[PDB]
């Protein structure tokens with residue numbers, strides 16, 4: 001995906017391609033089985049990138065936290081979809097609109113989904129207490 | 136919270152404030168939508184901090200593991216409280232004792248709670264097997 | 271464990287030893303309560319290691335993801351064991367074959383287990399939908 | 406009904422610890438001034454994002470004598486001073502245990518001793534991760550008292566590296582007004598500290614004017630034409646009386662001894678200016694002072710064979726520079742203890758300071774380093790399936 005990250009697919013490959021290259025990125029990195037006096041500064045600048053990679057990585061890989069699947073690579077949410085948002089089915093979805101040209105179709109619900117998602121997380125917290133109010 | 140971490144509230148703000156700034160830290164970082172020849176060493180020292188941030192971050196953000204909610208930002212445990220520990224209700228709790236002066240009130244149960252918590256985790260493991268002993 | 275990682279036991283100590291030093295690594299790091307003009311380059315080389323530590327750390331500490339326990343330090347899977355694989359019981363298991371000489375006994379099922387494990391993860395996904403097909 | 410537990414993450418709870426902190430210190434990395442030399446070699450250019458996310462109604466007892474952060478700054482400074490300052494021949498003492506012959510034999514230690522420079526750096530202190538440096542906008546405390554409208558920082562504020570006795574140079578100033586720091590009035594050693602909310606002028610010049618060095622078989626003679634001030638001392642006395650109510654207010658006794666506790670001892674040309682108890686040390690207070698009434702005069706001169714505030718034992722510095730020196734300042738406050746006792750009848754006198762661990766603690770009453778204890782416990786009604 002051109003960088004240490006974006007590592008769950010290749011551009012132009014439509015959705016299903018990237019979605020499945022998830023597991024093969026896993027399975028491919030699972031087993032593991034001249035230098036100038038001022039190369040210093042290149043190494044240096046080389047450093048940041050990797051850190052920042054992990055940093056952002058977490059930074060929302062973290063805040064998949066309030067989204068209920070931090071750390072991992074694959075959510076499934078619990079919200080009712082609004083056909084007003086995309087109105088498409090997996091067939092054309094995964095095989096077409098090579099994502100970069102996919103999400104622009106929904107460039108606006110970008111935060112409405114975060115809305116509904118954290119909302120259902122709080123929904124779960126509410127039902128956990130409802131269920132615990134007796135035992 | 137003065138650093139890359141401690142990022143779920145502001146000091147002096149009592150509990151409820153920080154507890155809710157949790158979700159807005161989430162929602163605020165969700166979308167994303169002179170240099171001296173020895174600046175080297177400052178960058179260098181700048182590095183550690185961020186790593187160590189993630190490192191500690193995990194290091195017990197990890198060992199929320201045995202606590203059953205690693206990775207995330209918000210637990211709810213499953214233990215019976217000892218009114219002998221604080222004997223307070225959410226109203227004054229969250230609005231008062233701006234935490235730094237909150238936990239000192241319970242500076243001793245610091246490890247008794249870890250006790251009971253990992254204990255109930257093992258309790259769950261025990262009930263899982265009890266329940267699985269037939270099917 | 272000779273490095274920032276491998277931190278859940280000591281070599282030669284058989285399994286049970288390392289398995290329990292897990293929790294005491296936790297409990298031991300929980301509380302927290304000459305320099306040459308070209309020391310630059312040693313610090314530099316010192317850097318990578320720590321990053322890469324976290325990097326690999328995650329990199330499959332991450333892909334414990336598809337294994338259903340990323341982030342953490344201790345899985346329990348859900349698969350039926352093949353006595354053809356080791357045919358041993360915890361007693362000798364944990365007290366003998368100081369792991370390095372343990373896993374060589376099963377140097378081949380290395381990927382069969384990943385097989386069955388991700389397989390049961392997908393099994394759970396399948397049962398979640400079966401269960402949700404009505405409500 | 407019943408009560409059960411919750412615990413959760415990240416809920417700012419910052420109990421005590423006082424561990425290592427790192428500096429934030431913008432040196433130049435070019436000037437030979439050893440201040441910046443250390444400020445870059447072992448210290449680091451500045452942090453541009455401090456976020457004093459002001460506290461709400463905290464109640465935390467920023468007890469200014471259980472802040473080992475202050476000891477840490479101390480040892481940082483002692484670390485700084487010695488590659489900073491070069492004692493030609495240091496005569497330090499030692500003994501190894503032999504009950505009474507403990508072998509206190511004078512250990513002479515030779516070195517090389519040229520000049521460099523002296524110019525403070527407002528350094529700042531920077532909690533490690535999971536650690537937070539509570540600040541304090543209130544400064545009064547009686548000595549031990551919280552602050553509503555402060556909170557955390559990322560690195561601290563400037564706390565400079567000059568050292569002086571009862572009275573500083575080129576240093577901090579005071580924020581709101583003049584307050585004091587002590588406890589019990591039974592025997593009263595308990596050194597008292599004031600931060601004086603204005604500035605003062607102290608300036609010493611000596612171009613050459615004294616070419617003839619010695620007197621017998623003066624260049625070390627320095628005349629400090631200062632100022633005149635007095636009204637800050639009137640504020641001094643009125644405070645003192647507000648804490649020492651029914652008695653007059655003198656100083657009345659500078660007994661003496663080792664020069665550094667009594668005399669104004671402050672660092673310039675790497676060296677210091679040592680006079681007697683003749684100046685500004687005198688006035689009594691019943692409702693008026695007792696002195697008198699540009700750069701006019703006060704006679705504090707230089708020595709060479711100094712004592713160390715650091716570790717007991719002498720030191721031997723270099724012959725001075727031809728002349729033409731100057732040092733200004735901005736007094737933040739003063740360092741005082743009652744010349745007390747039980748011989749006294751209704752006059753009262755204050756009298757002096759040489760322990761750095763407060764000399765840089767009229768600047769850190771705020772800073773209380775803490776970890777995070779972001780794991781928190783609380784009650785709910787939460788319990789599991791059986």
Ligand SMILES: *[C@@H]1O[C@H](CO)[C@@H](O)[C@H](O)[C@H]1NC(C)=O
Nearest residue numbers: 012013014015017095096098
């Ligand atoms: C892209 O076009 C090629 C045609 O050569 C086709 O083989 C490939 O399947 C297309 N990409 C996707 C994701 O279908």
Ligand SMILES: *[C@@H]1O[C@H](CO)[C@@H](O)[C@H](O)[C@H]1NC(C)=O
Nearest residue numbers: 079080081082083084085112
């Ligand atoms: C989304 O769908 C729900 C139910 O299907 C409906 O109540 C809601 O109004 C919809 N919102 C949008 C923006 O379509």
Ligand SMILES: *[C@@H]1O[C@H](CO)[C@@H](O)[C@H](O)[C@H]1NC(C)=O
Nearest residue numbers: 082083084085086087088089
């Ligand atoms: C929207 O969804 C409805 C569902 O019945 C479908 O019939 C229709 O073709 C869709 N329209 C568009 C423009 O996607």
Ligand SMILES: *[C@@H]1O[C@H](CO)[C@@H](O)[C@H](O)[C@H]1NC(C)=O
Nearest residue numbers: 090091092093094095096097
């Ligand atoms: C993708 O789009 C092309 C034409 O744009 C269409 O032929 C193809 O059937 C679509 N994908 C699927 C799975 O139908």
Ligand SMILES: *[C@@H]1O[C@H](CO)[C@@H](O)[C@H](O)[C@H]1NC(C)=O
Nearest residue numbers: 084104105106107108109110
């Ligand atoms: C969807 O996003 C686009 C972004 O340009 C915006 O113009 C459009 O108004 C959004 N949809 C609706 C219904 O507003």
Ligand SMILES: *[C@@H]1O[C@H](CO)[C@@H](O)[C@H](O)[C@H]1NC(C)=O
Nearest residue numbers: 215216217218219220247408
């Ligand atoms: C907490 O309460 C339970 C019963 O409510 C009791 O058995 C237990 O000993 C108590 N623990 C402490 C530390 O007070």
Ligand SMILES: *[C@@H]1O[C@H](CO)[C@@H](O)[C@H](O)[C@H]1NC(C)=O
Nearest residue numbers: 217218219221222223224408
């Ligand atoms: C402790 O909790 C009980 C609950 O009934 C309450 O009656 C009592 O006043 C509380 N005491 C203190 C000191 O908080």
Ligand SMILES: *[C@@H]1O[C@H](CO)[C@@H](O)[C@H](O)[C@H]1NC(C)=O
Nearest residue numbers: 225226227228229230231232
């Ligand atoms: C917090 O404490 C103050 C003073 O003790 C009180 O006025 C306020 O009501 C308290 N908060 C709550 C929620 O009771």
Ligand SMILES: *[C@@H]1O[C@H](CO)[C@@H](O)[C@H](O)[C@H]1NC(C)=O
Nearest residue numbers: 148149152229230231461462
């Ligand atoms: C603390 O007191 C201040 C006084 O203005 C008030 O604004 C604030 O709401 C209080 N704390 C809480 C948690 O309400």
Ligand SMILES: *[C@@H]1O[C@H](CO)[C@@H](O)[C@H](O)[C@H]1NC(C)=O
Nearest residue numbers: 219239240241242243244245
């Ligand atoms: C509660 O914690 C404090 C913290 O110092 C401790 O002194 C006290 O002994 C603890 N409580 C009991 C009952 O021991």
Ligand SMILES: *[C@@H]1O[C@H](CO)[C@@H](O)[C@H](O)[C@H]1NC(C)=O
Nearest residue numbers: 282283284285287365366368
């Ligand atoms: C290894 O042998 C030593 C004897 O030198 C013994 O003390 C130790 O228990 C053995 N290792 C383990 C893991 O038991």
Ligand SMILES: *[C@@H]1O[C@H](CO)[C@@H](O)[C@H](O)[C@H]1NC(C)=O
Nearest residue numbers: 349350351352353354355382
């Ligand atoms: C593993 O065990 C299952 C049932 O316990 C059996 O069906 C399978 O063939 C076994 N495979 C191996 C390799 O032993």
Ligand SMILES: *[C@@H]1O[C@H](CO)[C@@H](O)[C@H](O)[C@H]1NC(C)=O
Nearest residue numbers: 352353354355356357358359
């Ligand atoms: C294999 O497992 C069987 C199960 O009963 C046991 O009897 C046998 O001793 C085991 N053999 C080996 C070599 O582990």
Ligand SMILES: *[C@@H]1O[C@H](CO)[C@@H](O)[C@H](O)[C@H]1NC(C)=O
Nearest residue numbers: 360361362363364365366367
């Ligand atoms: C491990 O092997 C040794 C020698 O074969 C034996 O003495 C020891 O008891 C074994 N461990 C267990 C738990 O039986």
Ligand SMILES: *[C@@H]1O[C@H](CO)[C@@H](O)[C@H](O)[C@H]1NC(C)=O
Nearest residue numbers: 354374375376377378379380
């Ligand atoms: C088990 O692993 C070893 C590793 O050398 C391999 O030789 C052997 O073939 C594997 N077992 C089977 C049944 O193939």
Ligand SMILES: *[C@@H]1O[C@H](CO)[C@@H](O)[C@H](O)[C@H]1NC(C)=O
Nearest residue numbers: 646647648649650651652751
């Ligand atoms: C001693 O001080 C009090 C005020 O604290 C004052 O009222 C009283 O008059 C003083 N004593 C005399 C003898 O004036």
